[PDB]
Design a protein around this motif. Structure first.
Motif, mmCIF file in Angstrom:
data_model
loop_
_atom_site.group_PDB
_atom_site.id
_atom_site.type_symbol
_atom_site.label_atom_id
_atom_site.label_comp_id
_atom_site.label_asym_id
_atom_site.label_seq_id
_atom_site.Cartn_x
_atom_site.Cartn_y
_atom_site.Cartn_z
ATOM 1 N N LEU A 193 0.813 -1.132 0.084
ATOM 2 C CA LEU A 193 0.031 0.151 0.048
ATOM 3 C C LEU A 193 0.933 1.226 -0.301
ATOM 4 C CD1 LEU A 193 -2.636 -1.099 2.621
ATOM 5 C CD2 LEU A 193 -2.990 -0.899 0.063
ATOM 6 N N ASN A 194 2.111 1.146 -0.224
ATOM 7 C CA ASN A 194 3.115 2.354 -0.321
ATOM 8 C C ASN A 194 2.994 3.277 0.797
ATOM 9 O OD1 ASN A 194 5.172 3.568 -1.507
ATOM 10 N ND2 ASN A 194 3.473 4.777 -2.846
ATOM 11 N N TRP A 195 2.723 2.741 2.020
ATOM 12 C CA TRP A 195 2.321 3.580 3.125
ATOM 13 C C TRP A 195 3.633 4.487 3.570
ATOM 14 C CZ3 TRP A 195 -1.754 0.768 6.220
ATOM 15 C CH2 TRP A 195 -2.418 1.478 7.384
ATOM 16 N N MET A 196 4.858 4.053 3.216
ATOM 17 C CA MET A 196 6.141 5.049 3.370
ATOM 18 C C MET A 196 6.631 4.972 4.522
ATOM 19 S SD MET A 196 7.015 5.210 0.750
ATOM 20 C CE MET A 196 8.592 5.164 1.129
ATOM 21 N N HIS A 197 5.843 5.014 5.636
ATOM 22 C CA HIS A 197 6.611 4.922 7.202
ATOM 23 C C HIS A 197 6.970 3.628 7.799
ATOM 24 C CE1 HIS A 197 6.519 9.334 7.400
ATOM 25 N NE2 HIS A 197 5.363 9.349 6.498
ATOM 26 N N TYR A 198 7.415 2.942 7.155
ATOM 27 C CA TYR A 198 7.704 1.399 7.592
ATOM 28 C C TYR A 198 8.454 1.386 9.186
ATOM 29 C CZ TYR A 198 6.400 1.125 2.958
ATOM 30 O OH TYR A 198 5.618 1.495 1.911
ATOM 31 N N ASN A 199 7.991 0.694 9.952
ATOM 32 C CA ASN A 199 8.944 0.192 11.151
ATOM 33 C C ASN A 199 9.684 -1.019 10.620
ATOM 34 O OD1 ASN A 199 6.558 -0.967 11.836
ATOM 35 N ND2 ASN A 199 7.471 -1.174 13.607
ATOM 36 N N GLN A 200 10.610 -1.205 11.479
ATOM 37 C CA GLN A 200 11.379 -2.505 11.544
ATOM 38 C C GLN A 200 10.458 -3.830 11.251
ATOM 39 O OE1 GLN A 200 13.472 -2.060 15.383
ATOM 40 N NE2 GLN A 200 14.908 -0.711 14.214
ATOM 41 N N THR A 201 9.236 -3.730 11.870
ATOM 42 C CA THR A 201 8.311 -4.944 11.897
ATOM 43 C C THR A 201 8.039 -5.472 10.475
ATOM 44 O OG1 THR A 201 6.587 -3.448 12.584
ATOM 45 C CG2 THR A 201 7.512 -4.973 14.316
ATOM 46 N N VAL A 202 8.208 -4.737 9.448
ATOM 47 C CA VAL A 202 8.027 -5.111 8.186
ATOM 48 C C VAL A 202 8.799 -6.430 8.193
ATOM 49 C CG1 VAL A 202 7.268 -2.863 7.131
ATOM 50 C CG2 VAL A 202 9.668 -3.544 7.055
ATOM 51 N N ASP A 203 10.146 -6.493 8.566
ATOM 52 C CA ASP A 203 10.640 -7.620 8.642
ATOM 53 C C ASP A 203 10.296 -8.795 9.358
ATOM 54 O OD1 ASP A 203 13.843 -5.872 8.573
ATOM 55 O OD2 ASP A 203 12.684 -6.482 6.944
ATOM 56 N N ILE A 204 9.588 -8.460 10.473
ATOM 57 C CA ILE A 204 8.881 -9.466 11.156
ATOM 58 C C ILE A 204 7.719 -10.340 10.523
ATOM 59 C CG2 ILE A 204 7.411 -10.167 13.373
ATOM 60 C CD1 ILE A 204 10.490 -9.948 14.125
ATOM 61 N N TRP A 205 6.840 -9.708 9.804
ATOM 62 C CA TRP A 205 5.837 -10.060 8.799
ATOM 63 C C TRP A 205 6.631 -11.214 7.899
ATOM 64 C CZ3 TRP A 205 0.708 -10.078 8.286
ATOM 65 C CH2 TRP A 205 0.305 -10.396 7.118
ATOM 66 N N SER A 206 7.823 -10.695 7.470
ATOM 67 C CA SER A 206 8.551 -11.369 6.372
ATOM 68 C C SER A 206 8.934 -12.700 7.014
ATOM 69 C CB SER A 206 9.627 -10.602 5.740
ATOM 70 O OG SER A 206 9.175 -9.545 5.133
ATOM 71 N N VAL A 207 9.365 -12.623 8.307
ATOM 72 C CA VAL A 207 9.796 -13.894 9.261
ATOM 73 C C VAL A 207 8.761 -14.771 9.426
ATOM 74 C CG1 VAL A 207 10.702 -14.736 11.289
ATOM 75 C CG2 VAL A 207 11.702 -12.575 10.247
ATOM 76 N N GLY A 208 7.478 -14.315 9.585
ATOM 77 C CA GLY A 208 6.387 -14.932 9.901
ATOM 78 C C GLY A 208 5.883 -15.945 8.607
ATOM 79 N N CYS A 209 6.077 -15.215 7.487
ATOM 80 C CA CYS A 209 6.022 -15.846 6.142
ATOM 81 C C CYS A 209 6.921 -16.926 5.823
ATOM 82 C CB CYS A 209 6.032 -14.799 5.057
ATOM 83 S SG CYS A 209 4.642 -13.726 5.108
ATOM 84 N N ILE A 210 8.178 -16.743 6.237
ATOM 85 C CA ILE A 210 9.326 -17.762 6.028
ATOM 86 C C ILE A 210 8.822 -18.976 6.948
ATOM 87 C CG2 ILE A 210 11.553 -18.244 6.397
ATOM 88 C CD1 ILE A 210 12.249 -15.237 5.290
ATOM 89 N N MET A 211 8.708 -18.559 8.410
ATOM 90 C CA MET A 211 8.400 -19.454 9.213
ATOM 91 C C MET A 211 7.152 -20.530 8.832
ATOM 92 S SD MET A 211 7.812 -19.474 13.129
ATOM 93 C CE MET A 211 9.186 -19.842 13.945
ATOM 94 N N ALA A 212 5.937 -19.875 8.356
ATOM 95 C CA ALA A 212 4.802 -20.608 7.925
ATOM 96 C C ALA A 212 5.287 -21.617 6.956
ATOM 97 C CB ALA A 212 3.854 -19.701 7.327
ATOM 98 N N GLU A 213 5.885 -21.149 5.903
ATOM 99 C CA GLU A 213 6.400 -21.938 4.795
ATOM 100 C C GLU A 213 7.383 -23.186 5.188
ATOM 101 O OE1 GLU A 213 8.017 -19.555 1.823
ATOM 102 O OE2 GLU A 213 8.379 -21.220 0.586
ATOM 103 N N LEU A 214 8.292 -22.902 6.378
ATOM 104 C CA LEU A 214 8.996 -24.005 6.707
ATOM 105 C C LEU A 214 8.412 -25.167 7.434
ATOM 106 C CD1 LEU A 214 12.180 -22.146 8.362
ATOM 107 C CD2 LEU A 214 12.017 -22.778 6.023
ATOM 108 N N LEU A 215 7.177 -24.603 8.185
ATOM 109 C CA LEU A 215 6.514 -25.631 8.763
ATOM 110 C C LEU A 215 5.728 -26.499 7.952
ATOM 111 C CD1 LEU A 215 5.349 -23.043 11.761
ATOM 112 C CD2 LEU A 215 6.676 -25.410 11.849
#
Ligand SMILES: CCCCCCCCO[C@@H]1O[C@H](CO)[C@@H](O)[C@H](O)[C@H]1O
Length: 334
Positions: A177-199
């Motif tokens: 959504l091009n929100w602009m003001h990302y905090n670090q937790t955009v990387d936590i989202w990514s970690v969740g996606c990777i984890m889901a996939e590993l499981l």
């Protein structure tokens, strides 16, 4: 200084200290040889940057890459063994070579040719989040955490890299959504996606494009509540979101049925729409799913990282001279 030799490899003319030996093409902003380090008896990666000073964009990137790698000193983050240039002075300065540990396979080279145990999933994800705490403590946002950006050896040891050996699949909703003001937790989202996939052995959200991606996300986590919708300024985003039938938040326990229930809980705290409420790297590290691995006295933070340069429009020769300074001042590891 050391003595250099030249060599042709795949159309590129390579010139490195004699200390690096047996150069061979590993792959392909530069090309990469594997090489034997006669100094240590260890095999390494030697990356020749391509056209490091082609433009203002390349030059700042070249400096950005060298500054990052000089900073990263942590067992779960790629770091720098050596940097050099055949150039004798700034005047000749035109090539940059980077040397790191030879990393043989990425997380994807694993997931695809195996089915991971829970204990593997715990070790892999713990390592990710340990380095990510470190990365985040430097005030860096990774922004492109995905299986091709994670190096894993035969010993299932992991490091986060800047760049590989589909992104959208691991991107926080706020980024599409091009929100602009990302905090670090955009990387936590990514970690969740990777984890889901590993499981699961499956990509959690194999979106076809960015619109599809948002669709697949809402099916899992459900439509945004009132408290969140009121933060979306974009009329079009709001209309697309609300037009997509009110989806119930699925039970994560059914989506991940058969996973360690503690992995399901962690996943629920990672894959939260509201990035304010997303578990941080340090928090996650203390989650009981990692009880076997967690040690608060061996999860270090980084020295603060000066990234003011990012806020600068400079000339190619200025970025070039800054980069030249960084090569010259490099102090190798122990
Ligand atoms: C998938 C459909 C809607 C996605 C809602 C994403 C909510 C993102 O979370 C929001 O992100 C912003 C930081 O970028 C912050 O400014 C807001 O505080 C935060 O709530």
């Amino acid at each position: 200084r050391p003595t250099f030799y030249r060599q042709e490899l795949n159309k590129t003319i390579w010139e490195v200290p004699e200390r690096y030996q047996n150069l061979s093409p590993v792959g392909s902003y530069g090309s990469v040889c594997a090489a034997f380090d006669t100094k240590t008896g260890l095999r390494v990666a030697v990356k020749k940057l391509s056209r490091p000073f082609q433009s203002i964009i390349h030059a700042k990137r070249t400096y950005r890459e060298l500054r990052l790698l000089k900073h990263m000193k942590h067992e779960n983050v790629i770091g720098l063994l050596d940097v050099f240039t055949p150039a004798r002075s700034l005047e000749e300065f035109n090539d940059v070579y980077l040397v790191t540990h030879l990393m043989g396979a990425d997380l994807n080279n694993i997931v695809k040719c195996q089915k991971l145990t829970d204990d593997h999933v715990q070790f892999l994800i713990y390592q990710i989040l340990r380095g990510l705490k470190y990365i985040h403590s430097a005030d860096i946002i990774h922004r492109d955490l995905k299986p091709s950006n994670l190096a894993v050896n035969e010993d299932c040891e992991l490091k986060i890299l800047d760049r590989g050996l589909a992104t959208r699949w691991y991107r926080a909703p706020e980024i599409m959504l091009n929100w602009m003001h990302y905090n670090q937790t955009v990387d936590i989202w990514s970690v969740g996606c990777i984890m889901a996939e590993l499981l699961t052995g499956r990509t959690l959200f194999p979106g076809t494009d960015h619109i599809d991606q948002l669709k697949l996300i809402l099916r899992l986590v459900g439509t945004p509540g009132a408290e969140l919708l009121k933060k979306i300024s974009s009329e079009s985003a709001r209309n697309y979101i609300q037009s997509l039938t009110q989806m119930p938040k699925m039970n994560f326990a059914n989506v991940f049925i058969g996973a360690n229930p503690l992995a399901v809980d962690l996943l629920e705290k990672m894959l939260v729409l509201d990035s304010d409420k997303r578990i941080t790297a340090a928090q996650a590290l203390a989650h009981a799913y990692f009880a076997q691995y967690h040690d608060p006295d061996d999860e270090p933070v980084a020295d603060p990282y000066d990234q003011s340069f990012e806020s600068r429009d400079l000339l190619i020769d200025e970025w070039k001279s800054l980069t030249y300074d960084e090569v010259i001042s490099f102090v190798p590891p122990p």
